[PDB]
Amino acid sequence: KILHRLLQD
Amino acid sequence: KILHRLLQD
Amino acid sequence: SLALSLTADQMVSALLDAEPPILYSEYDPTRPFSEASMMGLLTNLADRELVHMINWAKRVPGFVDLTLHDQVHLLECAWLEILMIGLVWRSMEHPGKLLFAPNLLLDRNQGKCVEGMVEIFDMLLATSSRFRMMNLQGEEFVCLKSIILLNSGVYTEEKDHIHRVLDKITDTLIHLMAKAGLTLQQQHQRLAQLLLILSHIRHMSNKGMEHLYSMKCKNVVPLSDLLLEMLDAHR
Amino acid sequence: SLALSLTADQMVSALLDAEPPILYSEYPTRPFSEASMMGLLTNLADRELVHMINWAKRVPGFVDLTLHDQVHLLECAWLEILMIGLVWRSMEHPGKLLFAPNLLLDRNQGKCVEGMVEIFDMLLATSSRFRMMNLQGEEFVCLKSIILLNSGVYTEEKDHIHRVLDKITDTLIHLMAKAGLTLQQQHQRLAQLLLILSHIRHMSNKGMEHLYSMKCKNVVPLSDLLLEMLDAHR
Ligand SMILES: O/N=C/c1ccc(-c2ccc(O)cc2)c(Cl)c1O
Numbered sequence A, B: 001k002i003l004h005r006l007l008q009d
Numbered sequence C: 001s002l003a004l005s006l007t008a009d010q011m012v013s014a015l016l017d018a019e020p021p022i023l024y025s026e027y028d029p030t031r032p033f034s035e036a037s038m039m040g041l042l043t044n045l046a047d048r049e050l051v052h053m054i055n056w057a058k059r060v061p062g063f064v065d066l067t068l069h070d071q072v073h074l075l076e077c078a079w080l081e082i083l084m085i086g087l088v089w090r091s092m093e094h095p096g097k098l099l100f101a102p103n104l105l106l107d108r109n110q111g112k113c114v115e116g117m118v119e120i121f122d123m124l125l126a127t128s129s130r131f132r133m134m135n136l137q138g139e140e141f142v143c144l145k146s147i148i149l150l151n152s153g154v155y156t157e158e159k160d161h162i163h164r165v166l167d168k169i170t171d172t173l174i175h176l177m178a179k180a181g182l183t184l185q186q187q188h189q190r191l192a193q194l195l196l197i198l199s200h201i202r203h204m205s206n207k208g209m210e211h212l213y214s215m216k217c218k219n220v221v222p223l224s225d226l227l228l229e230m231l232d233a234h235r
Numbered sequence D: 001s002l003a004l005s006l007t008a009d010q011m012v013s014a015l016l017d018a019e020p021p022i023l024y025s026e027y028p029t030r031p032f033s034e035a036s037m038m039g040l041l042t043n044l045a046d047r048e049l050v051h052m053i054n055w056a057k058r059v060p061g062f063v064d065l066t067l068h069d070q071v072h073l074l075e076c077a078w079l080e081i082l083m084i085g086l087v088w089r090s091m092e093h094p095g096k097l098l099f100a101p102n103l104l105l106d107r108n109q110g111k112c113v114e115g116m117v118e119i120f121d122m123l124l125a126t127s128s129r130f131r132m133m134n135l136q137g138e139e140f141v142c143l144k145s146i147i148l149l150n151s152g153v154y155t156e157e158k159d160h161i162h163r164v165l166d167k168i169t170d171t172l173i174h175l176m177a178k179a180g181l182t183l184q185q186q187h188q189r190l191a192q193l194l195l196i197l198s199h200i201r202h203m204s205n206k207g208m209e210h211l212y213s214m215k216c217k218n219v220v221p222l223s224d225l226l227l228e229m230l231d232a233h234r
């Protein structure tokens, strides 16, 4: 998910 | 409306 | 108005004595379940429950002081929230089970027999678990249910009076918590925990309302005229 | 954890400094078509979402959750959080919705998109309600955090979320006691604030449903991030 990358970055 | 009738009964 | 001239103990007793009965289901345990029959049981039960909810709303302090138009609007907005929080309350001591009626106990596995009903079941089961963990008292329940009636439709002078009654119900909830030995910090916290649950009941009613309109467009479930009027009030 | 150790004054300063920026709309000379107005709203939402994640990570207690719990909470409350922010910005503009400093809309603009007037009216009603209540910024950042943690809590870890929710409640009461309100006025105002979150949830469900119909119409381009936030509700 795009939301995964945003939370980790 | 049925609701209107039941509210005034 | 008289709702303002009531003490907290008088407010609790008035709400408790106004409690509607627990209706039974037309459930034949020797009839094999089907998507049309299970939904027919839930809608038939809701239809008979609505009649008692109308007479329960009249005994809610402050609701009678409103115009009939305001009364119609508040009930059209909150009738499913009130049915659900009542269902959740009755099922509090039946973990993993929803007590629609004393003769109608359902778990999530039975909710799969109706498409889209599992998601509503689990939210209702989680709400009932939340009340059980919170050790929700009956006095607190009748307050929350009265809060739902006055609050769900208040956004579509009479509105100032409704908020005056709502503040009094808040004074009632705090009175109960102070009476139960809670500190002031615990009083505010429980009050917040209880009111935050209404956000989820609103969410469940929104979803249940959409699923109900889905049943109407398929018309495998016979819906009463009163239930169809409540359904057309949200869309 | 670390949020449980914060004083209520520290909780406020942590939330205020975590506030996302106010983004500008990509607008200009456009009487709004139905496709242009929804384009602005979705484009603004997509860019506002990127800042919401960084704001959520700065919410005391949110970093302590697992990645999946963080995703689930954001997937449930993202539209509520955008709406209560829009409602907050529009307070000083009665009858108008300040989507951006360069995008101020009223209910007549809602008529440019079918099904939008109803959501407009509800948003304006919440904004006027915040105006009447004289909502302070310190209270607003508490409500927005509560929405984030509460909206998806019912779908060990939840014990911590409820412990952080108790902390924000203590912070709200501290703010009201600091403003000179009586104890009765404190729990009354706390009750009035939290009951509005029930309507913020309602507007989100109405808006989430309206957004789905824009997808099946596919006249309005929706970002992949926005589609994934939408697919998490159905
Ligand atoms: O499509 N139909 C949706 C629906 C209707 C009623 C009810 C209901 C709720 C509580 C009652 O006491 C009684 C009934 C439920 Cl849970 C529903 O999901």
Ligand SMILES: O/N=C/c1ccc(-c2ccc(O)cc2)c(Cl)c1O
Residues within 6 Å of the ligand: D041, D042, D044, D045, D048, D082, D083, D085, D086, D099, D119, D207, D210, D211, D212, D214
């Ligand atoms: O179908 N429409 C969906 C939709 C999406 C986003 C937004 C929105 C809300 C708040 C913002 O700050 C920014 C944007 C709204 Cl109001 C919508 O109605």
